[PDB]
Symmetry: D2
Subunit: 379 residues, 4 copies
């Protein structure tokens, strides 16, 4: 779109930073030892990347959505897992706090994660409930002085590293999608237990496991907003989160392309260089135009959010198209690198593996199509 002069500066910051602090030496160590260095996280919160769109009124940074997408893109370009550690407090953890949270809860909960002292997990997915989050099975019972919960959450990002976790349980089992409340649970409490870290294909550096809740008591003073609102809470958080996922799609995309034209300029085979063979140069073109076309897709979505019009469709398109053509791009970049793009030392293979969940998690491409077509066909 068009970038505000402050957002151009932020772009400059996230560039020099993400490029400078995420060295080859480190990122290799993250894949081998699935542990992101706490020192870097602290370093990020110190300059506020953990607080981009939250305003100074609550002790944030006072940026706009476009600044969140800009930082998301420019980070994810260099490393995927970095992006994961970035989106959580900006969007998935700091979302429902920012919407359905009393002033006390925000004082005791949000500012810690913006400054990097506390870590917060957004926990919705169950073994029986994936795309159909409305078909949850975790229960939440009102006992008066506290709430009692009994359930199980799979695929919970960062959870073993998290201190509290926003967990969605079914309060009114009859109302279904109308009867879900949202609670803040201290993961250190009773009954709560974690599953094994899951061995995933990519995005290695951030642990991901199950949250098991066994007769865990949660005080009433730690419930998110109104009772039976939890579902709308999670949707309206999910829109900005999906903007996040499309944002990292576009990041790692632009990156794998940059590595693409670099290798294609440098490698020679028939006396010509690779990039002077028509098949390749056209292929580069094709990738470039999709990437831009759709950069414009997602930029537009975020600008809508910033000007307060509903972005529920526009974001869904952004996540869908961005992640899909990201995968197409990542693959093609392998193919330009040729054989060498299959060895782990060439950065393009880590990308190719990373960019695959992008079409699954945060709502599959199918769920995206369901939202969009369902929005265009109502009569």
């Amino acid at each position: 779109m068009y970038f505000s002069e402050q957002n151009k500066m932020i772009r400059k910051l996230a560039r020099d930073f993400a490029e400078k602090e995420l060295t080859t030496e480190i990122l290799d160590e993250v894949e081998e030892s699935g542990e992101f260095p706490q020192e870097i996280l602290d370093k990020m919160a110190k300059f506020g990347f953990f607080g981009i769109k939250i305003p100074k009124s609550l002790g944030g940074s006072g940026g706009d959505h476009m600044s969140y997408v800009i930082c998301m893109e420019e980070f994810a370009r260099v490393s995927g897992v970095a992006s994961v550690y970035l989106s959580s407090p900006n969007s998935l953890a700091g979302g429902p706090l920012l919407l359905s949270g009393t002033e006390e809860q925000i004082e005791k909960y949000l500012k810690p994660i913006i400054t990097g002292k506390k870590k917060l997990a957004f926990a919705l997915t169950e073994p029986g409930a994936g795309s159909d989050a409305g078909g949850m099975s975790t229960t939440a019972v009102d006992m008066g002085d506290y709430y009692l919960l009994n359930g199980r959450k799979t695929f919970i990002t960062m959870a073993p590293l998290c201190d509290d976790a926003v967990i969605y349980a079914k309060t009114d089992m009859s109302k279904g999608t109308r009867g879900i409340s949202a609670f803040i649970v201290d993961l250190k409490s009773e009954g709560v237990s974690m599953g094994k870290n899951e061995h995933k294909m990519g995005l290695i550096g951030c642990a991901t496991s199950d949250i098991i809740m066994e007769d865990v008591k949660v005080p009433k003073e730690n419930r998110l907003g109104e009772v039976n609102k939890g579902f709308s809470n999670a949707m309206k958080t999910l829109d900005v989160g999906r903007l996040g996922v499309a944002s990292q799609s576009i990041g790692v995309a632009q990156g794998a392309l940059d590595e693409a034209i670099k290798y294609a300029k440098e490698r020679k085979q028939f006396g010509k260089r690779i990039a002077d063979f028509q098949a390749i140069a056209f292929m580069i073109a094709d990738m470039a135009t999709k990437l831009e076309a759709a950069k414009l897709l997602v930029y537009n979505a975020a600008s809508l959010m910033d000007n307060k019009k509903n972005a529920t469709k526009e974001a869904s398109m952004a996540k869908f198209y961005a992640s899909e053509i990201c995968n197409e791009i990542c693959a093609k970049a392998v193919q330009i690198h040729g054989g060498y793009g299959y060895i782990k030392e060439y950065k393009v293979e880590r990308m190719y593996r990373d960019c695959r969940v992008f079409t699954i998690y945060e709502g599959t491409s199918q769920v995206q199509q369901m939202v969009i077509s369902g929005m265009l066909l109502k009569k």
Copy 2:
């Protein structure tokens, strides 16, 4: 992108107009009798659609590029051939006049075509020179009091209806791309003769033939700008023209989609309506998201032109992606209509046929990829 409040009004105008004046009854008669009604052309120039981006300083309308794209889109949606009769004086005829034309030439030539009295053909393509316009063969010789030309131009839109035609001939046969001048030729003069109207697949209502030049003398006072500049003249006209072609791609696209979701809402087969079958609804989604993604592509290109930064890449992407996904869309719309979308009474078949040149003319998709990749790979 974001639309200026005047451009929203223009959108309203071109909508009510194109919708109101291009009735089924007429458009059917245009396909049967390959003749667009002069009365409608006059009607268009009377409200200035023939003069959108040319400023009031020269007797134009004072709009911006985004207003040219808006009108191009909203017209082309309803009828392709209408768009053709629209882009000519706005972009292809009024371009080189606006750039490399003396004040006298513009007084005697441009204002007529803005008011619809004169018609001007942009003639570059030869039988031997297509994508490679630099390999022209029409010659132009300096005799002192006039220029003498000898050549032949194929595929010249509107030419039998045109009064003068901007014709590019080779002056310095040795310089090639560096030695091409541009001349204004009265088509009524000596030696000049026209070929047969070509029977094309779609875009029926506008005649298209060869311009044959046989020892035709042209006065020196009718040359475009400097000698041997003609080529750069034609390129810099071609950028805004390509914006035009992408503009009509996006128009007829949005239209065939609108007909798409309409038929899919109305038709019933298994008791359900068509649109409630998952394959279709998802298909609608896919088409919609590409179309928007890329609407954002071309809107962005035009905004760049309006703010004076070079749009030579951005436009090329716009023409490429827009026309290609337009064809994909047009086809899919046939497939939703099912059998009925194969009969001429259903508007979708005229679209499907129209939208096919979009990837060929104004520079093929291959030439587009050549420009783009060649721009990204220079080292």
Copy 3:
């Protein structure tokens, strides 16, 4: 696959024939005047092309299914409409006779159409019943000595040229798919009336209209096989018909490819010939490998039919994949021809238009996917 030496001979015949009798001069007149020359049909039946798979036991020709596909392919390469006039008596007309017809019915009905004296239309589709042929609305009532019918059929190939027509009507309206009988109706009789010839996009030379039935009485002696088997009758004819449609898919494909590499060898741009630009040569490759891959798909289906195992899935895959990649091929061939491929004199545009229905009629690609997936997931 591997062709039996007699089938190679048949390939030679249909090649030299279709090439020699279907000249450019004729086919243009067929497009302009939507009338195929009766003299050519007679000429075809005289050498037996009207009777390929019907055996000499009934006075047919004694070929195998692979011989029907061979003639279908080699004809369709040269002209689409020829194929339409070819498949009808081989598959669509001679099918239900061959399954559920007594020897008398075959004596009075089939031999005429094998020798080209009579013409038979296969009429199933209604305005309300397309893909869902089971939701028919045409009725058939038992009066003892004859049946009484009241309904309406759209999109009936060749019908205004046909002497009798196999019409599927609902006898037991409650049984639905289980309660449909098939009757032979002489179109010259009472009540029978035709709709307008439909103006279709391509495949021009064969009329196609509605068959309107208003209290038309039909004798019992003209019913297909047992009562209420008709639906399975029509399905099992539809399988070999679908083999037909894939056959012409593969035909027009080979043609448009042959024009593709021919034009690409002959035309030169920028000094090189077209075919020496890497993009084109690769494009040719891509079309070729798909085409072959899937030629092998369809040859195999027909060979299965010849060795008597059920070919109901395999044919469905053949029709689906063959028709879709046929369209992709046809388009790409236009794009190689460049601008010239948009004028009707270049054969590639007639192909491009013909090959479009291929994915709709004889069961859409969607119906194909429904059949195939429904066949693979039953456990």
Copy 4:
């Protein structure tokens, strides 16, 4: 095609075998410890899988090419790395021996690898010479009683496990593609040294490194056939090898599809089971029809080889189309599994990673297109 009854039996054997000996427990340990169990290789040679197409005349097994593809497919379905350990002695090692090797050389070299005592690496690729194998830089000098070599080979499968290696060096540096001889070098000799094992994305269990030659002297008695024929030797081995690669393409495809429809039958969302949502069932269909279409592509190529006509194009199409649509399939299968398909315990992710090299090695898809188009346009 149509399988000879002995080849159906062989299909049964390789199925029950690959299924019974390659258990989940083992294959996980192979990924973790990049070492395939020697006990299994011995077990395979004991039943002759190491000698499929080599005939009993030389102490082989007497199968046909179709039997090599059958075992390749049915093995690769279950595990990719198994296939790698399978194709080497059948095609890549036993190829050049079979063409340009004297009976003594075959006595001392081939029978060991058919019985699994010795291992032979096919070493052609250099760091400067990939697709352009003709631009080699390894040298071979004639000293009379032996040859002296100095060069370097990257990406040599199985090399650290191999006892001898067929190495292609340039003898006449001026003749280029016409001046390459092929030699057998015992890897335990002098000068010979190995590079590091390369960390590849998938196909983990088989080591792959550089073969470094530093003034290694090789006796004349170990040269392949006539001098300077070696290149055509290596090409004509590469054709059957490419048939191999397409064979495993088709294998891992069938596997990932089988996991696809299995998971899609068992998993239920929103109340329905996965497979009863139209998008999925159609997706399954699409993968299936392509897979079959092209299974037929490759079966046919191998049958041609068995009946002795040149299969150089047909195999190239088979490798190209087979590997590409294999990747498309593998990915889509991930997407059906949803989130769970991104964790290593679900077999589909190992497939997805394995099937990626398939389009690069044994000649890239680009080299395939170059061969195919170059074969179709020569006139």
